[PDB]
């Protein structure tokens, strides 16, 4: 579902861009992949 966030300020924009990228890339992963990643980190 494609939505548009209006942003005032370059610094705020760049910060939200970095976070958006990281969250969107994580969202593609199935739960079991995220779960396995978490376990492997905890070891």
């Amino acid at each position: 579902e494609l939505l548009y966030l209006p942003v005032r300020g370059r610094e705020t924009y760049e910060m939200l861009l970095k976070i958006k990228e990281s969250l969107e890339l994580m969202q593609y992963l199935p739960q079991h992949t995220i779960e396995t990643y978490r376990q492997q980190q905890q070891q």
Binding site: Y28, L29, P30, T33, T36, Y37, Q40
Partner: protein, 126 residues
């Protein structure tokens, strides 16, 4: 337990032809996957190890295995510009219409990365 699968993934990435053959005579899972769904065939196609691609296909490697982002071996061979690997994957039934989770075919990744020779081969493979 067994690190045979892990050792085959590493051997296929590193291009250690002989090590791959040894690991599979020793019963290593040809379709072993890491946490992102990368198989030996994925890694060999990515890193351009033609003879390893060949032995894996001969031993029952799934030519259309998907990573967690819907990437296939043919996608990786196209992205990273390995023409002979693209041709071998095509002859062994690689899905030319496979789309990753970003809607990209192998052809699309070839175009996006200026590998126009590979793009042409993929377009004709139709």
């Amino acid at each position: 337990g067994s690190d045979l699968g892990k050792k085959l993934l590493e051997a296929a990435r590193a291009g250690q032809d002989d090590e791959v053959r040894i690991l599979m005579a020793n019963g290593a899972d040809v379709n072993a996957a890491d946490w992102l769904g990368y198989t030996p065939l994925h890694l060999a196609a990515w890193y351009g190890h033609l003879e390893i691609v060949e032995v894996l296909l001969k031993t029952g490697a799934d030519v259309n295995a998907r990573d967690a982002y819907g990437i296939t071996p043919l996608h990786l061979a196209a992205y990273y510009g390995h023409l002979e690997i693209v041709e071998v994957l095509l002859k062994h039934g690689a899905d030319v219409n496979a789309q990753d989770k970003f809607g990209k075919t192998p052809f699309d990744l070839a175009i996006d990365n200026g590998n126009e020779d590979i793009a042409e081969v993929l377009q004709k493979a139709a």
